[PDB]
């Protein structure tokens, strides 16, 4: 009854409806099996294992799935990738992510870490074995993790190495924060996201104190992204098929997260947004031109549950650490939910 760390091609399960027009349902109908009606998780009696969320092939496999899903489901009017100018029909679709379970074939199982304060790297004490992960929504977004799980008890900082400025930081919140984004009915590309400033600024103070724990009580300062493509300099996401790009500078206003409190930072934070038609393809170095937005109210209400951050570094002769929203790539989104799981081979 021993096992070894190995990678194998997983298969997906879902509750997809074959009669639904929604694109995730459509993809999962033909690409996944029905969810396990009788899942069996068995505790591994007094077993300590070694997990590493930052080196886990389930993340890459989920990434390939989301690539297939988006390429199959999102039809741009024009694609301009290399020397290619291809034009096709671009109907607007029903887009709302659904949870996806990832399962091992015969001869493999998934070890799940049940430690309430697991940070994703190192030894785990409460190890269980499962055949399928829990259902994970493939939410594509930047700078902010949405519609995900929460940490059990405390805010969790996840990183392969916090002292390595090239390793991105996942902040796992324990309290969700609502972000409410609206393109009002009757400029068709102007929109906004509304955030409760009191609730968000308090959560940000908690995040700041948690980072203080990991960085020798240094001063924690937030700054906007130092550069890059618009997809990562802005909080970009998909709402009802439309590609929202939102400015998050007001989400990291240091003057509102100080110990002195006050200032008029307890009101509603309104982030200006644009629904973009030209989007840089993520599969391979391209451009996609979609149709203008549909008419009427375009609304999405989401749970901010995580924050992707990058630390500056190069400090030395300074007494503070500077953090900017964003990450290395989209696999971090899947790591934020797959940190508990790891595939092993039974032999």
């Amino acid at each position: 009854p021993v096992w070894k760390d190995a990678d194998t091609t997983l298969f997906c399960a879902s509750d997809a409806k074959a009669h639904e027009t929604e694109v995730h349902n459509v993809w999962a109908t033909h690409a996944c099996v029905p969810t396990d009606p009788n899942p069996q998780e068995i505790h591994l009696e007094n077993v300590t294992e070694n997990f590493n969320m930052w080196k886990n092939n389930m993340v890459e496999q989920m990434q390939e799935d989301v690539i297939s899903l988006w390429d199959q489901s999102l039809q741009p009017c024009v694609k301009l990738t290399g020397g290619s100018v291809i034009k096709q029909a671009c109907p607007k679709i029903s887009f709302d992510p659904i949870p996806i379970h990832y399962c091992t074939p015969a001869g493999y199982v998934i070890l799940k870490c049940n430690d309430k304060n697991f940070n994703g790297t190192g030894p785990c004490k409460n190890v269980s074995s499962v055949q399928c992960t829990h259902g994970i929504k493939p939410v594509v977004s930047t700078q902010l993790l949405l519609n995900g799980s929460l940490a059990e008890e405390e805010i969790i900082i996840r990183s392969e190495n916090l002292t390595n400025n090239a390793k991105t930081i996942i902040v796992h919140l324990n309290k969700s924060v609502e972000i409410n984004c609206t393109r009002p009915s009757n400029d068709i590309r102007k929109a906004y996201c509304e955030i409760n400033g009191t609730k968000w600024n308090k959560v940000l103070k908690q995040v700041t104190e948690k980072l203080k724990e990991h960085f020798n009580n240094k001063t924690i300062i937030f700054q906007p992204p130092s550069g890059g493509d618009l997809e990562i300099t802005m909080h970009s996401f998909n709402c009802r098929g439309e590609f929202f790009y939102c400015n998050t500078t007001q989400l990291f206003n240091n003057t509102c997260i100080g110990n002195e409190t006050m200032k008029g930072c307890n009101g509603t934070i309104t982030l200006p947004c644009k629904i973009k038609q030209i989007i840089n393809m993520w599969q391979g170095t391209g451009q996609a031109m979609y149709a203008p937005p549909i008419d009427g109210k375009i609304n999405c209400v989401s749970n901010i549950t995580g924050i992707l951050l990058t630390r500056d570094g190069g400090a030395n002769n300074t007494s503070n650490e500077t953090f900017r929203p964003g990450g290395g790539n989209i696999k971090d989104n899947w790591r934020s939910e797959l940190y508990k799981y790891k595939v092993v081979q039974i032999e």
């Epitope: 390595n164 090239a166 500056d312 400090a315 790539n329």
Partner: antibody, heavy 127, light 98 residues
């Protein structure tokens, strides 16, 4: 093998901007960050920042924030997609910017330590 | 990371460059000739790359990393630099007395 070839150095005027290129070969350009490290004559190595070729994400040392910009030119033709070129631009040059500038990258999968280095180009900032 | 600005040795001797700080980080070592790019000679505290003389060794127990050169040759006349991530030492110029 893995090669990093630099271009675009020389004499510049006080003020003005300089642009340096780092053309890479021997590996998938998207898979490795590009770091820039400068060295004044007879001084130590100083890291200026890195640039992720995936979305152009950058990370700048405070000494160069608001003065440096790191960009990338990705491959277009699908029969040669491993090709890539990184660019570094430093504006508002002063005499104390005179240095030899390198592009560097780490081992496969990581960013540090810098196993591979470009030949370096010299920049002088004068009258 | 601080190291002596320079150092001196005679051929056949054993010399040691020391870097303080490091903050207990794995650290690497570079050798650099005048007018040439730096070349990595130590990574992961003590591993050389291929083509680096076996007379080069390194160790970092804690705060202090140390590079030791045994059987010093005139080709070792160069600047040796300790490194942790993006931070580099000032560089120690090893002069082989001729």
């Amino acid at each position: 093998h893995v090669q990093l070839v630099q271009s675009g150095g020389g004499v510049k005027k006080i003020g003005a901007a300089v642009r340096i290129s780092c053309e890479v070969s021997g590996y998938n350009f998207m898979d490795q960050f590009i770091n820039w490290v400068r060295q004044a004559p007879g001084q130590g190595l100083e890291w200026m920042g890195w640039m992720n070729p995936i979305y152009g994400q950058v990370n700048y040392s405070w000494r160069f924030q608001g003065r440096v910009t790191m960009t990338r030119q990705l491959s277009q033709d699908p029969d040669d997609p491993d090709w890539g070129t990184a660019f570094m631009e430093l504006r508002g040059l002063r005499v104390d910017d005179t240095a030899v500038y390198y592009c560097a990258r780490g081992p496969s999968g990581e960013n540090y330590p810098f196993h591979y280095w470009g030949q370096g180009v010299r920049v002088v900032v004068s009258s | 990371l601080t190291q002596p600005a320079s150092m001196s040795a005679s051929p056949g001797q054993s010399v040691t460059i020391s870097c303080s700080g490091t903050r207990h980080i794995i650290s690497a070592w570079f050798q650099q000739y005048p007018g040439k790019p730096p070349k990595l000679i130590i990574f992961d505290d003590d591993k050389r790359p291929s083509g680096v003389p076996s007379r080069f060794s390194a160790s970092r127990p804690g705060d202090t990393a140390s590079l030791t050169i045994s059987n010093v040759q005139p080709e070792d006349e160069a600047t040796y630099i300790c490194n942790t991530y993006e931070f580099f030492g000032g560089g120690t110029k090893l002069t082989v007395l001729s």
